[PDB]
JSON list of C-alpha atoms in Angstrom, two decimals:
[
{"chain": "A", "resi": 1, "resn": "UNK", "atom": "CA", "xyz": [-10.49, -84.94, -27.23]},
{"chain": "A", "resi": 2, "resn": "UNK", "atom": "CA", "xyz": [-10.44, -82.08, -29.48]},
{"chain": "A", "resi": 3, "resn": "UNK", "atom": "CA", "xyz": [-13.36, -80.75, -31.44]},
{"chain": "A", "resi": 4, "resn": "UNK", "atom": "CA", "xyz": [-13.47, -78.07, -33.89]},
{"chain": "A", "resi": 5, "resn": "UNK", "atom": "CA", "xyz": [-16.09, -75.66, -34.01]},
{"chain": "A", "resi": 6, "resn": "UNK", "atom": "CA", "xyz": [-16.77, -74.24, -37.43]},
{"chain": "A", "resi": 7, "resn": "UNK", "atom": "CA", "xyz": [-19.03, -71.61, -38.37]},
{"chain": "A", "resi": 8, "resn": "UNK", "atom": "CA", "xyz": [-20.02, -71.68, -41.74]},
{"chain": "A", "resi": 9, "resn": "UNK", "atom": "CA", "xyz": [-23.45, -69.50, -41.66]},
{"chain": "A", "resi": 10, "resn": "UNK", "atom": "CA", "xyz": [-23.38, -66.04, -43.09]},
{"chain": "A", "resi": 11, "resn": "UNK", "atom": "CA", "xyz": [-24.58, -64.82, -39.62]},
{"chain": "A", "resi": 12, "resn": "UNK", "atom": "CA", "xyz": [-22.46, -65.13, -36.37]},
{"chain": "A", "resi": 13, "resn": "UNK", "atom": "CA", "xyz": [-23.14, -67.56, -33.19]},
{"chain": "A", "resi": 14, "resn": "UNK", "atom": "CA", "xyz": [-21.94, -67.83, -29.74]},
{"chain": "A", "resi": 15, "resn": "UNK", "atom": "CA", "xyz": [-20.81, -71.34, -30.01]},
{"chain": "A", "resi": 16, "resn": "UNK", "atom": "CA", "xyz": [-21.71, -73.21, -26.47]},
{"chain": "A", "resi": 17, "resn": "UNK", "atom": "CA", "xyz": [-20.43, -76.25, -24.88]},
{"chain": "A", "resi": 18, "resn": "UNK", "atom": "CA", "xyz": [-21.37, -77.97, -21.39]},
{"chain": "A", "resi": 19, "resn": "UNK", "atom": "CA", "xyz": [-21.92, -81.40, -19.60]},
{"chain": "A", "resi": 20, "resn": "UNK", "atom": "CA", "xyz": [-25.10, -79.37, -18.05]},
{"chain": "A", "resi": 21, "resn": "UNK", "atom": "CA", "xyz": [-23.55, -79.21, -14.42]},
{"chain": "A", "resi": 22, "resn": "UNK", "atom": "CA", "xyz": [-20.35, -76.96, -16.01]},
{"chain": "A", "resi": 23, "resn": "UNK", "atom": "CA", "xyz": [-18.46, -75.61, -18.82]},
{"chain": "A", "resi": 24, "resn": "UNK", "atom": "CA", "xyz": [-16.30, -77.87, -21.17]},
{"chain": "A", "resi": 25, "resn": "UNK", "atom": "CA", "xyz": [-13.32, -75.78, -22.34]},
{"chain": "A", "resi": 26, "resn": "UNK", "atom": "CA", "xyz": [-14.50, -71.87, -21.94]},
{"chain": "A", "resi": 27, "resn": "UNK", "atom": "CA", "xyz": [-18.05, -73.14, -22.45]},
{"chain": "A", "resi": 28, "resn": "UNK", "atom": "CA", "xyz": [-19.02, -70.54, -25.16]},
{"chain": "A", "resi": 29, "resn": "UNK", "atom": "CA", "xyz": [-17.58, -67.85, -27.94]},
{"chain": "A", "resi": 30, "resn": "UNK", "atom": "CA", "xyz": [-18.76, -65.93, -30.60]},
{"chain": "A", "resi": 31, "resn": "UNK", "atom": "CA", "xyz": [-17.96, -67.82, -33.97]},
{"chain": "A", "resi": 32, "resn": "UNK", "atom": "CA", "xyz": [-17.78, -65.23, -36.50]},
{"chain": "A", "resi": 33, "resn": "UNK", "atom": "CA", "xyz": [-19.47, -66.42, -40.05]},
{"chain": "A", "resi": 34, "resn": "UNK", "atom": "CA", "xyz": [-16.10, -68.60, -40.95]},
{"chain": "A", "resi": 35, "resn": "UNK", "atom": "CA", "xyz": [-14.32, -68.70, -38.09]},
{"chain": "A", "resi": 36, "resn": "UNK", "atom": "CA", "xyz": [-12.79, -71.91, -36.28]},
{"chain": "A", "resi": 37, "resn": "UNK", "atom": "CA", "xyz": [-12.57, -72.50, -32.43]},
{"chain": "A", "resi": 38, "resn": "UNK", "atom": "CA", "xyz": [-10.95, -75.57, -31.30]},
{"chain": "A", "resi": 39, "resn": "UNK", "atom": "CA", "xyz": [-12.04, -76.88, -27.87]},
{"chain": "A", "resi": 40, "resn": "UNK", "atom": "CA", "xyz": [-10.78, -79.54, -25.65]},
{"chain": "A", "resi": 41, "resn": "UNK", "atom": "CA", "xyz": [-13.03, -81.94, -23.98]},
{"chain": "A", "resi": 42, "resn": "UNK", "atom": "CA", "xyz": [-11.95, -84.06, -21.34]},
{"chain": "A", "resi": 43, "resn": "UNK", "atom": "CA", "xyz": [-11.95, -87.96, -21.90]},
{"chain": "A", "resi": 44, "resn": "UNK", "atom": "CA", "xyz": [-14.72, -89.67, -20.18]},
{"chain": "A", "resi": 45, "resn": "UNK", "atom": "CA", "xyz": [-17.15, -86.89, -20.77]},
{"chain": "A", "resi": 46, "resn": "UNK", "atom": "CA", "xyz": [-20.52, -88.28, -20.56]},
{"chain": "A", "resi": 47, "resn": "UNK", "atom": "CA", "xyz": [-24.09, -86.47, -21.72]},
{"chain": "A", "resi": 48, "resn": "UNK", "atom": "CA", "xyz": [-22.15, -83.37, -22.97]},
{"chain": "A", "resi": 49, "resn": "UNK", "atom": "CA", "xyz": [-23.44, -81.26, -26.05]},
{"chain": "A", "resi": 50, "resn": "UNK", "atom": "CA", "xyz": [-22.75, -78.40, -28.25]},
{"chain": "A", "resi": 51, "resn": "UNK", "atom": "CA", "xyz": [-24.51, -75.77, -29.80]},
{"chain": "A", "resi": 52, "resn": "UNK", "atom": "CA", "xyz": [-25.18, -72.48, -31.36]},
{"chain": "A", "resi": 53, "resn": "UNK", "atom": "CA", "xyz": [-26.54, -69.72, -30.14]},
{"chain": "A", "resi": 54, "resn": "UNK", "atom": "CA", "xyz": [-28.12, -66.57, -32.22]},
{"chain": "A", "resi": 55, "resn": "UNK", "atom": "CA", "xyz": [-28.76, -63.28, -31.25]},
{"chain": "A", "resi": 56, "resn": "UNK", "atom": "CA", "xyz": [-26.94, -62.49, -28.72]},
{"chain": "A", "resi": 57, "resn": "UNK", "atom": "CA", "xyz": [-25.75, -59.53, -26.43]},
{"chain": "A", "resi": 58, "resn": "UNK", "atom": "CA", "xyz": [-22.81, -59.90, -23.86]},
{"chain": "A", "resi": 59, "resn": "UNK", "atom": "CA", "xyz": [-21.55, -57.31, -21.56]},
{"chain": "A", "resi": 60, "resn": "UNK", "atom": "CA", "xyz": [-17.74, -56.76, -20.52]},
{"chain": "A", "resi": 61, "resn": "UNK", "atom": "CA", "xyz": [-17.62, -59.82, -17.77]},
{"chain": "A", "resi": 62, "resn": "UNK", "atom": "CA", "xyz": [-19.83, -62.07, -20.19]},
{"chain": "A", "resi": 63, "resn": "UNK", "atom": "CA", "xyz": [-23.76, -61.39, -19.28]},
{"chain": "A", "resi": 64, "resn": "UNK", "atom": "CA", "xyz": [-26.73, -61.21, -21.66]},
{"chain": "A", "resi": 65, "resn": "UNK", "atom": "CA", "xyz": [-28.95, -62.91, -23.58]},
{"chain": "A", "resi": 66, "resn": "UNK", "atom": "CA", "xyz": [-29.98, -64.70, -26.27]},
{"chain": "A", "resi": 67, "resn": "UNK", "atom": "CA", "xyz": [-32.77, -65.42, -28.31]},
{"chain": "A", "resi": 68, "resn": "UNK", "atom": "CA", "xyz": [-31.95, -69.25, -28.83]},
{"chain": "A", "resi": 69, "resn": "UNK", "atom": "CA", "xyz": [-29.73, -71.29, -26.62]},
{"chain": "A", "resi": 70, "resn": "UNK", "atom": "CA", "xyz": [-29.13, -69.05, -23.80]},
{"chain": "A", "resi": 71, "resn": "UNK", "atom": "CA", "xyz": [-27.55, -70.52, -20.75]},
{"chain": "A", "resi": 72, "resn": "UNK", "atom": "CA", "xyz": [-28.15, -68.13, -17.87]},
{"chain": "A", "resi": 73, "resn": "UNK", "atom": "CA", "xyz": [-27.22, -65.55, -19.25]},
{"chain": "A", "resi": 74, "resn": "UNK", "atom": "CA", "xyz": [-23.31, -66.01, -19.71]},
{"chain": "A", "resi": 75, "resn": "UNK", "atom": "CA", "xyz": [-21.61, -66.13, -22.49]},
{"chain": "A", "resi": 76, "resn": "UNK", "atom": "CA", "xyz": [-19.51, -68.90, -20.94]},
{"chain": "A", "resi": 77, "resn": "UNK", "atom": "CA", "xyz": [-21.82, -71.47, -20.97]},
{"chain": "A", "resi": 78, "resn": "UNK", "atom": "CA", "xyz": [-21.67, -73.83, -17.58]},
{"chain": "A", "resi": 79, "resn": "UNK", "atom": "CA", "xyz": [-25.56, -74.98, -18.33]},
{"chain": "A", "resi": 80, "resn": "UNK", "atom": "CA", "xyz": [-27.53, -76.20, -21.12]},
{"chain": "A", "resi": 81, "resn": "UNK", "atom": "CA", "xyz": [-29.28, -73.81, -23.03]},
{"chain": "A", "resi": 82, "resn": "UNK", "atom": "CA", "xyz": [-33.05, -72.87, -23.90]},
{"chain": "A", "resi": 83, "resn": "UNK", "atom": "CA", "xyz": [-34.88, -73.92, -26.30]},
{"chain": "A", "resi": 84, "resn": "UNK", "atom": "CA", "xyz": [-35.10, -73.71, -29.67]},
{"chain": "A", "resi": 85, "resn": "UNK", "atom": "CA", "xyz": [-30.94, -75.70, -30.06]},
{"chain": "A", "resi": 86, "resn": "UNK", "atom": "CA", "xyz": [-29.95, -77.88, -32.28]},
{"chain": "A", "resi": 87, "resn": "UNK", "atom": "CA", "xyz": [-28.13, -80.04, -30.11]},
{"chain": "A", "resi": 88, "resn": "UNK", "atom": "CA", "xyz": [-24.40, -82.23, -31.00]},
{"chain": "A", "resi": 89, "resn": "UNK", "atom": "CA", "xyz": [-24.54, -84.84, -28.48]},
{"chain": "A", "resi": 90, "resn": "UNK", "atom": "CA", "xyz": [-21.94, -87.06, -27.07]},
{"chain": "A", "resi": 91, "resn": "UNK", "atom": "CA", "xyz": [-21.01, -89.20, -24.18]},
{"chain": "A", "resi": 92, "resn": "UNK", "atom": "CA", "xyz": [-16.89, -89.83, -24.64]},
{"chain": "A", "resi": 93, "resn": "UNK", "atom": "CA", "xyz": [-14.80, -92.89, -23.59]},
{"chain": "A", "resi": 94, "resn": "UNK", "atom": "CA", "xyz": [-17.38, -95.05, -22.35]},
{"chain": "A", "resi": 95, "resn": "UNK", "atom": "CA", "xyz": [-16.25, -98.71, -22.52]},
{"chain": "A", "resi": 96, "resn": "UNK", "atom": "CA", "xyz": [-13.96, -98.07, -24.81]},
{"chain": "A", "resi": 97, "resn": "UNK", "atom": "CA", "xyz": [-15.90, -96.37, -27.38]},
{"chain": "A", "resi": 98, "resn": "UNK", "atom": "CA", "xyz": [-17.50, -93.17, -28.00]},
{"chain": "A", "resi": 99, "resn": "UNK", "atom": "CA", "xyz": [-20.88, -92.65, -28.81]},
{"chain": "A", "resi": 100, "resn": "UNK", "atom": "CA", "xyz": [-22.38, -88.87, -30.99]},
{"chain": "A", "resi": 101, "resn": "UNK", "atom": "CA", "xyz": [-25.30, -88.15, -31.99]},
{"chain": "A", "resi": 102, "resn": "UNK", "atom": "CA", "xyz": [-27.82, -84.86, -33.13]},
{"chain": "A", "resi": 103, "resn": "UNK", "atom": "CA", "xyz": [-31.34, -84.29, -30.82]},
{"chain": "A", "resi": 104, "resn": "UNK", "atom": "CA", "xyz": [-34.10, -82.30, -32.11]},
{"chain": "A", "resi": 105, "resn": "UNK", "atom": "CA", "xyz": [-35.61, -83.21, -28.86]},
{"chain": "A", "resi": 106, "resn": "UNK", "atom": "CA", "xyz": [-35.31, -79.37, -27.48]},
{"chain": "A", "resi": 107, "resn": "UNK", "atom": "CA", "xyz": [-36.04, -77.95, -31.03]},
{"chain": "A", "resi": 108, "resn": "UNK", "atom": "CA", "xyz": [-34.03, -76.51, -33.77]},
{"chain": "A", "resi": 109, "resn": "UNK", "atom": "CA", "xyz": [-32.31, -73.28, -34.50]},
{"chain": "A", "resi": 110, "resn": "UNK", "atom": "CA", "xyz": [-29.66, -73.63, -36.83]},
{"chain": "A", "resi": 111, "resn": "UNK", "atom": "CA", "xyz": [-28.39, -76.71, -39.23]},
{"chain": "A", "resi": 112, "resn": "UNK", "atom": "CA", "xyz": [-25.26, -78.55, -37.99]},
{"chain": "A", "resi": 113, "resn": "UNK", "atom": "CA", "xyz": [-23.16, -81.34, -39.49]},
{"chain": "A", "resi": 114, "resn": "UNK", "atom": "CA", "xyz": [-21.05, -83.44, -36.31]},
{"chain": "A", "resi": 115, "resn": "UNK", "atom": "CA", "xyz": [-18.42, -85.59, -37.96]},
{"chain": "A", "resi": 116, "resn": "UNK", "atom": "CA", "xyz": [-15.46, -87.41, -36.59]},
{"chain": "A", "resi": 117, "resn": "UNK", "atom": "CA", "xyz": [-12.32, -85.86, -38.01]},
{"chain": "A", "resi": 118, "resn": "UNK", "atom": "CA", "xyz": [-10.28, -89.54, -37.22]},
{"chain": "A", "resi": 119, "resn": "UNK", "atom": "CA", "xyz": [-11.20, -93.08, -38.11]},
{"chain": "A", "resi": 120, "resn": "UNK", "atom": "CA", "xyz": [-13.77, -95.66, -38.21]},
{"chain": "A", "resi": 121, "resn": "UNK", "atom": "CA", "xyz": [-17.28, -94.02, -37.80]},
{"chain": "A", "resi": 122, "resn": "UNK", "atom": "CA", "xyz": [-19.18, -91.96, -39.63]},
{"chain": "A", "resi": 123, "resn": "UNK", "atom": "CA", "xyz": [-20.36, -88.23, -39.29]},
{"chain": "A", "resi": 124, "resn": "UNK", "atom": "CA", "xyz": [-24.66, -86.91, -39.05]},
{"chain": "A", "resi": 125, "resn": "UNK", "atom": "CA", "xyz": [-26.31, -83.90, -39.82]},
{"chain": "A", "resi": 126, "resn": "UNK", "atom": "CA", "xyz": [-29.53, -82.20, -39.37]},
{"chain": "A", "resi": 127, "resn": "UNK", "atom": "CA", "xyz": [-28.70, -79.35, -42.32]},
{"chain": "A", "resi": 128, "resn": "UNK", "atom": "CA", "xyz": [-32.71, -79.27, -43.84]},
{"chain": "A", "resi": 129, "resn": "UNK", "atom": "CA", "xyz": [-34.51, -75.48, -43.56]},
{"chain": "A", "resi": 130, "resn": "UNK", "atom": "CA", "xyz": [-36.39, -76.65, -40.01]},
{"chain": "A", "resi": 131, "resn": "UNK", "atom": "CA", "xyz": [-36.77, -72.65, -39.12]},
{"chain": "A", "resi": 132, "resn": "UNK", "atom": "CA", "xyz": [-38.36, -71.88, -42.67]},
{"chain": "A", "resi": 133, "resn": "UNK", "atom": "CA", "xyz": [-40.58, -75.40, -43.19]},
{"chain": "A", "resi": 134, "resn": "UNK", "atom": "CA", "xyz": [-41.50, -75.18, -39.24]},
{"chain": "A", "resi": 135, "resn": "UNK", "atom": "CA", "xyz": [-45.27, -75.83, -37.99]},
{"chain": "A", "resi": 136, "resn": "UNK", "atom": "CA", "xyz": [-46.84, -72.95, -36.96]},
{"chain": "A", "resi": 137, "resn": "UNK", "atom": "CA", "xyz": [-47.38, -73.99, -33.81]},
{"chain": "A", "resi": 138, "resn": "UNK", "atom": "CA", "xyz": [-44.26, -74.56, -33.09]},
{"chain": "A", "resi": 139, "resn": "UNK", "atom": "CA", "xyz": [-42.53, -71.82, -34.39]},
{"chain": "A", "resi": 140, "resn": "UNK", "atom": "CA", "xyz": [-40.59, -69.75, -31.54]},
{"chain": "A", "resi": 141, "resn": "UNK", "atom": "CA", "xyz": [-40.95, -66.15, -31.94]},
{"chain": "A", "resi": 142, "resn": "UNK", "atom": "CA", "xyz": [-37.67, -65.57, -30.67]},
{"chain": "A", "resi": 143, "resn": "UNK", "atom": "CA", "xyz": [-36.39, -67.11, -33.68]},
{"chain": "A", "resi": 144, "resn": "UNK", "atom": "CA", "xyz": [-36.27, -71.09, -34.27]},
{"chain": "A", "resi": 145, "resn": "UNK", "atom": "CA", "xyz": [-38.17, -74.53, -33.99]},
{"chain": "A", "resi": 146, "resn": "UNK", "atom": "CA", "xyz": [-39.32, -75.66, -30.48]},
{"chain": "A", "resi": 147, "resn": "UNK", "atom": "CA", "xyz": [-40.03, -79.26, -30.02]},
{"chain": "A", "resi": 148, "resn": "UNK", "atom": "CA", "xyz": [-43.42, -79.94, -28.80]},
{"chain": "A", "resi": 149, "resn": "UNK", "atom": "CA", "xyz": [-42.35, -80.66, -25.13]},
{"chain": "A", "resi": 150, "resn": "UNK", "atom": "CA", "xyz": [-41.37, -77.05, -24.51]},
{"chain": "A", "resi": 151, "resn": "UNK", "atom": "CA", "xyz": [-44.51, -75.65, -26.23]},
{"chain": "A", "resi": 152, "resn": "UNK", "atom": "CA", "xyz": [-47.23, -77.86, -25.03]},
{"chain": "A", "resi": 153, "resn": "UNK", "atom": "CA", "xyz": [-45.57, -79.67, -21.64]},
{"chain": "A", "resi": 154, "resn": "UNK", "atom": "CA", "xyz": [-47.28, -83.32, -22.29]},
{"chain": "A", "resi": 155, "resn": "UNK", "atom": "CA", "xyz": [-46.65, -86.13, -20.91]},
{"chain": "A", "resi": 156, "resn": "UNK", "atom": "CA", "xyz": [-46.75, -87.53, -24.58]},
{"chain": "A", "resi": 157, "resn": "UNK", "atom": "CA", "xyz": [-43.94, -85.26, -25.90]},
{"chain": "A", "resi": 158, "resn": "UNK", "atom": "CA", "xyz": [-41.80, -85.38, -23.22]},
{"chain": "A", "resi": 159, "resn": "UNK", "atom": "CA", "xyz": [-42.06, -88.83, -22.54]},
{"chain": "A", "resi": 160, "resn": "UNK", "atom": "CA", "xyz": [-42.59, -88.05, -18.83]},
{"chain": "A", "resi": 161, "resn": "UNK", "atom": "CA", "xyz": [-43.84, -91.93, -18.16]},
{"chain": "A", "resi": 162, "resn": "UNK", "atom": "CA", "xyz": [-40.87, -93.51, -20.41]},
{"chain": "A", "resi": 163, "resn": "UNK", "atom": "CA", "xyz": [-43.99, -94.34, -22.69]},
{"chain": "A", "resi": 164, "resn": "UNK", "atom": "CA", "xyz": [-44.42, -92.01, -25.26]},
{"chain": "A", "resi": 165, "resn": "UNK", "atom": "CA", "xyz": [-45.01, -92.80, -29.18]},
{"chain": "A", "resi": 166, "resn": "UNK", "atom": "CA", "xyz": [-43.97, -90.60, -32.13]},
{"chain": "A", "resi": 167, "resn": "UNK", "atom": "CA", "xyz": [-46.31, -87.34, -33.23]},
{"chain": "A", "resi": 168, "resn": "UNK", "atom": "CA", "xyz": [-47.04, -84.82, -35.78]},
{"chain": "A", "resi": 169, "resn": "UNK", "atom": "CA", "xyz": [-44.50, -82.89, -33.97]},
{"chain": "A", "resi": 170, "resn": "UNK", "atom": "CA", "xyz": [-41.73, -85.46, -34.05]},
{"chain": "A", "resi": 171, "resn": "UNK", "atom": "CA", "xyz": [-42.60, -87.21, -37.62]},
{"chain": "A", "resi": 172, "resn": "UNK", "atom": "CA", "xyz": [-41.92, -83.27, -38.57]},
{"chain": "A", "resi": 173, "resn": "UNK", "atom": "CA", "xyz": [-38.24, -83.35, -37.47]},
{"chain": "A", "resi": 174, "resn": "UNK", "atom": "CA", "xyz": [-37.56, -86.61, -38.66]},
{"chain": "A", "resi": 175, "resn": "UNK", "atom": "CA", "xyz": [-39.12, -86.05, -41.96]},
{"chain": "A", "resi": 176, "resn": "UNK", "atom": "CA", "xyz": [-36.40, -83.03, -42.47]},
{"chain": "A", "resi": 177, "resn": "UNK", "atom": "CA", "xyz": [-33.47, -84.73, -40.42]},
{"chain": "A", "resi": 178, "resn": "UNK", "atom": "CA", "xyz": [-34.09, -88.58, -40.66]},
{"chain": "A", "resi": 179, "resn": "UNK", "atom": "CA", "xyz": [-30.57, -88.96, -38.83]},
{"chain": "A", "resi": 180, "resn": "UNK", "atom": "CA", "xyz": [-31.11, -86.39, -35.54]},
{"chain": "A", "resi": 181, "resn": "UNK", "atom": "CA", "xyz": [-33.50, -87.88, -32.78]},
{"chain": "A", "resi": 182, "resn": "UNK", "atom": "CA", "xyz": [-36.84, -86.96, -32.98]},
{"chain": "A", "resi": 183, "resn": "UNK", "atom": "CA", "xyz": [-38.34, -87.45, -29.39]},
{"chain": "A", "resi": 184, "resn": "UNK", "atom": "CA", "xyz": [-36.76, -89.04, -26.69]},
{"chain": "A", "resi": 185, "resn": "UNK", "atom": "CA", "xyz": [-37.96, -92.53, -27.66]},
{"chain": "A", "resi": 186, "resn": "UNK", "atom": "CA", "xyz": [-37.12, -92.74, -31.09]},
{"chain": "A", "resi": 187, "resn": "UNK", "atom": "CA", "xyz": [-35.28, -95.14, -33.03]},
{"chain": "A", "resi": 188, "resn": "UNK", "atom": "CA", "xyz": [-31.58, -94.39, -32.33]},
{"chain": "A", "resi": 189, "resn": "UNK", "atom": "CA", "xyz": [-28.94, -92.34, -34.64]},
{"chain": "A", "resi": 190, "resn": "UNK", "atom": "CA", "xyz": [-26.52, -92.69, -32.19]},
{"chain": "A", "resi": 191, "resn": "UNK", "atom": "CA", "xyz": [-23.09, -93.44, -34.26]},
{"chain": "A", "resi": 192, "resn": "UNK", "atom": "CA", "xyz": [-20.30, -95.73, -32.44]},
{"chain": "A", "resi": 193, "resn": "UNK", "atom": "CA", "xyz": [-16.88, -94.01, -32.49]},
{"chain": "A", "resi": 194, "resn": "UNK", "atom": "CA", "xyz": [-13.44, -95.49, -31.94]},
{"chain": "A", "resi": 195, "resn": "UNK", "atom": "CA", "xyz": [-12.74, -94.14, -28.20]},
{"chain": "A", "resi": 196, "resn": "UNK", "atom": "CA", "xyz": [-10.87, -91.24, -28.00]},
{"chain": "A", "resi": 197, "resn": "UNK", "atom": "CA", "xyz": [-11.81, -89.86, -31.44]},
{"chain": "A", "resi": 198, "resn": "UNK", "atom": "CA", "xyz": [-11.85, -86.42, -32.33]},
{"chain": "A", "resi": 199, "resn": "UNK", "atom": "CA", "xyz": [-14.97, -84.17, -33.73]},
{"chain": "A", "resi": 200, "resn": "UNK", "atom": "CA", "xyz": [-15.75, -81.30, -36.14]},
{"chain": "A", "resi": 201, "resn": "UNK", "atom": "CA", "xyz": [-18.84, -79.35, -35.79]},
{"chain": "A", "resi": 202, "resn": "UNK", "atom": "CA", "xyz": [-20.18, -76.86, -38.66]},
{"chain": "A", "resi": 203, "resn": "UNK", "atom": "CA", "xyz": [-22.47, -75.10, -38.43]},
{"chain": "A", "resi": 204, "resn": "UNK", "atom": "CA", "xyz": [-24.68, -74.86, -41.97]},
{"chain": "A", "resi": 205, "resn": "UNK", "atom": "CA", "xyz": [-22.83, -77.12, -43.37]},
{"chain": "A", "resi": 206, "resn": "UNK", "atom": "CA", "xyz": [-24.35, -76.68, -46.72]},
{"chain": "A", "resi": 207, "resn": "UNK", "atom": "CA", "xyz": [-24.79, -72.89, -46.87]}
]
């Protein structure tokens, strides 16, 4: 499956992409405020994710840091990144379909649109100003939005027991992004794609 990578913030990002236990495609690349990457994901790729990262320094072999979304250092991402991300989600080819979705769950950093670029679903986006309209509480000094689990470490908001209930944290997120999961047991967003689609991701899609 192919999926475009489009950044249309006035700022660059390191563009990252993983299944957590390794890299899809190169796993990360600096994205330029306009530029395109287009990345190949294997079929059957289950619980991978893509997102931005801001800030960022890289040495000649590809070791840094960044302030959001840093995965170990590298800019060839073979983990997940830290906290504050915005997070495209997607589990590919399962039973015939694919399933996409946007998580707030591990915060917000910058506004993303994740639309299929065939047929027969329907594209989400988390685009509202999260950094600017943030609690205080929550805001990461770094830059960006954690989600109450990484700030507080509850059992609560990080649904440790599989029991957890919505909270001023979460009804925050889903206030701004009704369509991006809120906490781990929220109602789903989760959009049903044809199997085998294909996927854009932009970046702030509206500015």
């Amino acid at each position: 499956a192919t999926f475009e990578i489009v950044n249309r913030c006035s700022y660059t990002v390191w563009a990252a992409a993983s299944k957590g236990d390794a890299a899809l495609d190169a796993g990360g690349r600096q994205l330029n405020s306009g530029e395109s990457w287009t990345i190949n994901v294997e079929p059957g790729t289950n619980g991978g994710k893509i997102w931005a990262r801001t800030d960022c320094y890289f040495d000649d072999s590809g070791s840094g840091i960044c302030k959001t979304g840093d995965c170990g250092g590298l800019l060839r991402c073979a983990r997940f990144g830290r906290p504050p991300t915005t997070l495209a989600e997607f589990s590919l080819n399962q039973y015939g379909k694919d399933y996409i979705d946007i998580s707030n769950i591990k915060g917000f950093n910058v506004p993303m649109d994740f639309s299929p670029t065939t047929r027969g679903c329907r594209g989400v986006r988390c685009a509202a100003d999260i950094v600017g309209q943030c609690p205080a509480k929550l805001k990461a000094p770094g830059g960006g939005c954690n989600d109450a689990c990484t700030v507080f470490q509850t059992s609560e908001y990080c649904c440790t027991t599989g029991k957890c209930g919505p909270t001023e944290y979460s009804r925050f997120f889903k206030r701004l992004c009704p369509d991006a999961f809120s906490y781990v047991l929220d109602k789903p967003t989760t959009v049903t794609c044809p199997g085998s689609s294909n996927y854009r991701v932009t970046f702030c899609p509206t500015a």
